[PDB]
């Protein structure tokens, strides 16, 4: 019911292609977004979710839309053939978020971190600092091979909203056989 | 001076002469024209600063300076 | 599987290190860091005698890989094929790998250069050019590999081991060097590319541009000691001077492929020599007295008449020849590559030109101020 | 993937419907009953209206050319 | 802007329809959506009037 626009950032880098998760990472993201996108619209029928690919560039494949069909359909042919750039991904997701057609929805972002992020620790925190000022809650969930609970990533979520913040979770998924059930249990119903 | 439009394309070539490849914007000749309908509107729209089409000695010389 | 890499674990420096290090990755269903080491361990200095084991290991690994790069596959099967050294099945084998990854990934050219690599040694002409053309027509919509070009260029460099591939080689040899920039190959690899290029450029029928002589990072930077005469001779052609002591001094070296074409090369230098002079001309005095042309190229006056006849024939000039005075009036439509000093000199002239264009503008605006309106 | 094909069909059905609606509101009435006189080739026909005026049509219009006959 | 001045800045064509130039020709879905999208670009103007051509007939209603 909480009016919020979920700008889901789905990874499509090359490492996203090795299936430490049973069938493949992508289906995990592709299955995962299926629930997060569906989770938000079910919670509130006035909601809207868009997706930003994060590898090799920051494409905006589907702008912020309520209809979940477009997000699901666009997921296909996501073609994981790039290198993740999370430094810019959040900005473009937020900058696109700033174009919210309705100005009332709260802000909530879901990032699909599935590759090793090569970002200076100082840069990530400064990005987090800009998010704090502008009151956007972003959830980070990690997939596939990556320095488990990257220190750069973990510092990001903590400064994301601390001092008794909303708790934009850095939900770390158990690598190995696991569906979005971990991604749906904790983050999807509570972010 | 004039021509407030500059038109560019996208070409990705091997730069024949042994140099790195890149995206780059190639240039395409630009020219400003008018179809009949807009032409009638534009001609009236100025209607206060348009120069005589005949030119005359005064305007021809200014065409050279 | 794990046992097989255990049994064929040998043949790599640090048997456990070479193989079992990556084995930890395959268990956790990942397929990238393996190949690069696989390519690196196939790039690892070895006879690749474990090729049959590595082939099977690669084949076994590639059989249930379904993730590793077909570049490494080809790079390893080529290292394989360069190591199995069995061209008879290499074509057949490379084709099956190609067909087994039939998406847009451009591995067939490498297989075409694999048929290249092995059919450029067996049956090297009939359809190889087709093996090129099919690649060239297909090699569109994605300029990201840069090896599709090179093997064709290299196969055209191997096809450079044909009659009508010199300028095609030089034009393509320059093209390749742009695609791959860094050393990323032995100084021997780079200096080899420069020598066969310059030796081609000085030999190419349709090439007297020589623009990249000084501006090409490889040929210019490389080859400072190893047969540096080429940079001098290559620099010579941009100057056109007689220099025939050098051509002789470099004649002591590079005896093959240069003596056989001294008649052609001398004609080339004569041809450029004219373009050199009419560039050095003071512009206004664009005419060239027969004596001055004959003295520069040390060619008798009876043949300066025909030298200009050629150079103007191919398209390196758009002038006209006089005989009563025998001054060849010159008008150029064939420009040459430039240089810092040339450009510095070219700009200094242009500063004068804008000075005059400015002066005459003031002498008109001031004069006709009343009429200017 | 079956759902994805269904989504593409559902979108196609709306656009087919939207194009059909624009054609439907542009069909309208009344029609001047004319008499196709010929068909020059160079999809364009020379209609001779019943009002005794001829009018070459650059595009034959909302019909299949092959159906239209002199 | 006031009683003595009606300022028109931009015009947007309402798609030609078989009705002609009539109230019915004003497609409420087309106008409501187009206005909504022109508001994002920086033109939050109000519908100040309507225009229609008159192929040679003159300037009369």
Helix (H) or strand (E) run with residue A111 in it: strand A106-113
- Residue in chain B nearest C372 by alpha carbon: B62
Task: Give the total residue count for chain E.
Answer: 61
Neighbours of A39 (CB within 10 A): 21
Residue by residue, DSSP assigns A27-95 as HHHHHHHHHHHHHHHHH-TT-EEEEEE-BSS---SEEEES-HHHHHHHHSS----B-B-HHHHHHHHHH
Whether residue A133 is contained in a domain is answered as yes
- Residue in chain D nearest E24 by alpha carbon: D25
Q: Structure solved using which method? A: cryo-EM
Whether residue A11 is contained in a domain is answered as yes
- Residue in chain D nearest A74 by alpha carbon: D4
**Contact (Cβ atoms closer than 8 angstroms) between residue C199 and residue C234:** no
Whether residue A99 is contained in a domain is answered as yes
CA distance C144 to C133: 18
Cβ of B37 under 8 Å from any chain C Cβ? Answer: no
Whether residue A141 is contained in a domain is answered as yes
List CB contacts of B19: < 8 A, sequence separation 6 or more: C178
List CB contacts of C112: < 8 A, sequence separation 6 or more: C131, C132, C134, C135, C151
Task: Compute the nearest-CA separation of C242 from chain A (Å).
Answer: 54
All residues of chain C having their beta carbon less than 8 Å from the beta carbon of residue B18 are 174-178, 212, 216
- Residue in chain D nearest E17 by alpha carbon: D26
Q: Cα C155 from chain centroid?
A: 12
Task: Kindly tell me the sign of the dihedral angle through the C-alpha atoms of E2, E7, E12, E16.
Answer: positive
Question: What are the distances in angstroms from CA C50 to CA C77, C253, C256?
Answer: 12, 41, 39
What are the residues of chain C with a beta carbon less than 8 Å away from any beta carbon of chain A? 28-32, 67
All residues of chain D having their beta carbon less than 8 Å from the beta carbon of residue E17 are 25-26
**Contact (Cβ atoms closer than 8 angstroms) between residue C294 and residue C301:** yes
> First-to-last CA distance in chain D?
49
Query: What residues form DSSP beta bridges with C126?
Result: none
Whether residue A155 is contained in a domain is answered as yes
Cα within 13 Å of Cα(A121), Cβ side: 6
Paired tokens of C46: 């070895």
Question: What are the distances in angstroms from CA C102 to CA A144, C4, C60, C117, C143?
Answer: 27, 29, 20, 20, 18
Q: Which residues of E are annotated as a binding site for Zn(2+)?
A: 52, 54
Strands (DSSP E) found in chain C: none
Cis peptide before D30 (omega within 30 of 0): yes
- Find the domain containing A156 and state its range: 3-186
Paired tokens of B41: 């509107």
Whether residue A57 is contained in a domain is answered as yes
Q: How many domains does chain A have?
A: 1
Dihedral through CA C227, CA C232, CA C234, CA C238, nearest 10? 180
**Contact (Cβ atoms closer than 8 angstroms) between residue A143 and residue A176:** no
**Contact (Cβ atoms closer than 8 angstroms) between residue D33 and residue D50:** yes
Query: Quick check: A73 and D1 CB within 8 A?
Result: no
CA distance A54 to A83: 8
Residue by residue, DSSP assigns C64-122 as TTSSS-HHHHHHHHHHHHHHH--HHHHHHHHHHHHHHS-SS--HHHHHHHHHHHHHTTS
Task: Compute the nearest-CA separation of A19 from chain D (Å).
Answer: 20
Query: Quick check: B15 and C178 CB within 8 A?
Result: yes
Give the closest residue to C7 by CA, choosing from C69, C46, C53: C53
**Contact (Cβ atoms closer than 8 angstroms) between residue D38 and residue D45:** yes
Q: Between A and C, how many residue pairs show a Cβ–Cβ distance under 8 A?
A: 14
CA distance C228 to C234: 10
All residues of chain C having their beta carbon less than 8 Å from the beta carbon of residue A14 are 32
CA distance C215 to C238: 12
Whether residue A191 is contained in a domain is answered as no
Paired tokens of E33: 């959506």
CA distance C313 to C299: 19
CA distance E58 to C298: 86
Query: Quick check: D27 and E15 CB within 8 A?
Result: no
Whether residue A104 is contained in a domain is answered as yes
Give the closest residue to C112 by CA, choosing from C97, C132, C93, C92: C132
């Amino acid at each position: 019911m909480v009016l919020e626009s979920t700008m889901v950032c789905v990874d499509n880098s090359e490492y996203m292609r090795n299936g430490d998760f049973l069938p493949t990472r992508l289906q995990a993201q592709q299955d995962a977004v299926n629930i997060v996108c569906h989770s938000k619209t079910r919670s509130n029928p006035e909601n809207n979710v868009g997706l930003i690919t994060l590898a090799n560039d920051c494409e905006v494949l589907t702008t912020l839309t309520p209809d979940t069909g477009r997000i699901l359909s666009k997921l296909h042919t996501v073609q994981p053939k790039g290198k993740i750039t999370f430094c810019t991904g959040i900005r473009v997701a937020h900058l696109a978020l700033k174009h919210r057609q309705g100005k009332n929805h709260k802000m909530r972002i879901i990032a699909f971190v599935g590759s090793p992020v090569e970002d200076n620790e100082k840069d990530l925190v400064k990005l987090a600092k800009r998010l704090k000022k502008e009151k956007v809650n972003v959830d980070i969930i990690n997939f596939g091979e990556e320095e488990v609970n990257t220190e750069k990533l973990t510092a990001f979520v903590n400064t994301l909203n601390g001092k008794d913040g909303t708790g934009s979770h850095l939900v770390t998924v158990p690598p190995g056989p696991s569906l979005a059930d971990a991604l749906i249990s904790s983050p999807i119903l509570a972010g | 001076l004039g021509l407030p439009t500059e038109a560019y394309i996208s070409v990705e070539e091997v730069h024949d002469d042994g140099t790195p490849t890149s995206k780059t914007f190639e240039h395409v000749t630009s020219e400003i024209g008018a179809e009949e309908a807009e032409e009638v509107g534009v001609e009236h729209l100025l209607r206060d600063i348009k120069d005589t089409t005949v030119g005359t000695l005064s305007q021809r010389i200014t065409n050279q300076v | 599987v794990p046992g097989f890499l255990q049994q064929s674990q040998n043949s790599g420096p640090g048997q456990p290190a070479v193989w079992h290090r990556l084995e930890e990755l395959y268990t956790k269903k990942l397929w990238h860091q393996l190949t690069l080491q696989v390519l690196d361990f196939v790039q690892d200095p070895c006879f690749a005698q474990g090729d049959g084991l590595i082939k099977l290991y690669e084949n076994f690994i590639s059989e249930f890989e379904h993730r590793v790069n077909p570049l490494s596959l080809v790079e390893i099967i080529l290292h394989v094929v360069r190591q199995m050294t069995d061209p008879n099945v290499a074509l057949t084998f490379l084709e099956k790998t190609r067909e087994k990854v039939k998406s847009s990934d451009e591995a067939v050219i490498l297989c075409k250069t694999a048929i290249g690599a092995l059919k450029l040694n067996i049956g090297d002409l009939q359809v190889t050019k087709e093996t090129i053309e099919d690649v060239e027509e297909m090699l569109n919509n994605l300029p990201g590999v840069t090896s599709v070009h090179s093997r064709f260029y290299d196969l055209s460099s191997k096809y450079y081991q044909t009659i009508g591939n010199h300028a095609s080689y030089y034009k393509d040899a320059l093209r390749f060097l742009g695609c791959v920039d860094i050393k990323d190959l032995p100084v021997s690899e780079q200096q080899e590319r420069a020598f066969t290029l310059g030796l081609a450029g000085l030999l190419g029928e349709g090439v007297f541009n020589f623009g990249e002589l000084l501006m090409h990072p490889v040929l210019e930077s490389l080859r400072n000691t190893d047969r540096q005469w080429l940079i001098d001779t290559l620099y010579a052609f941009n100057s056109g001077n007689v220099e025939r002591f050098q051509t002789l001094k470099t004649a002591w070296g590079q005896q093959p492929d240069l003596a056989a074409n001294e008649a052609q090369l001398l004609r080339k230098i004569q041809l450029l020599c004219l373009m050199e002079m009419t560039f050095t001309r003071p512009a206004n005095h664009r005419q060239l007295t027969f004596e001055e042309i004959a003295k520069s190229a040390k060619i008798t006056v009876n043949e300066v008449e025909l030298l200009v006849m050629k150079a103007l024939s191919v398209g390196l000039v758009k002038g006209s020849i006089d005989e009563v005075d025998k001054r060849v009036h010159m008008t150029w439509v064939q420009p040459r590559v430039l240089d810092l000093q040339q450009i510095k000199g070219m700009k200094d002239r242009l500063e004068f030109w804008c000075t005059d264009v400015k002066s005459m503008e003031m002498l008109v605006e001031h004069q006709a101020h009343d009429i200017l309106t | 993937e079956v759902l994805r094909v269904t989504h593409e069909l559902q979108a196609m059905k709306d656009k087919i419907k939207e194009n059909s609606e624009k054609i439907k509101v542009n069909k309208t009435l009344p029609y001047l009953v004319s008499n196709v006189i010929e068909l020059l080739d160079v999809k364009c026909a020379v209609i001779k209206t019943s009002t005794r005026q001829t009018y070459f049509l650059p595009v034959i219009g909302l019909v299949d050319a092959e159906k239209l006959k002199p | 802007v006031d009683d003595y001045t009606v300022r028109v800045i931009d015009v947007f064509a309402m798609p030609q329809s078989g009705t002609g130039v009539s109230v019915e020709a004003v497609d409420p879905v087309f106008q409501a959506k187009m206005l909504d999208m022109l508001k994002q670009t920086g033109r939050p103007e109000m519908v100040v009037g309507w225009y229609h051509s008159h192929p040679g007939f003159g300037c009369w209603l």
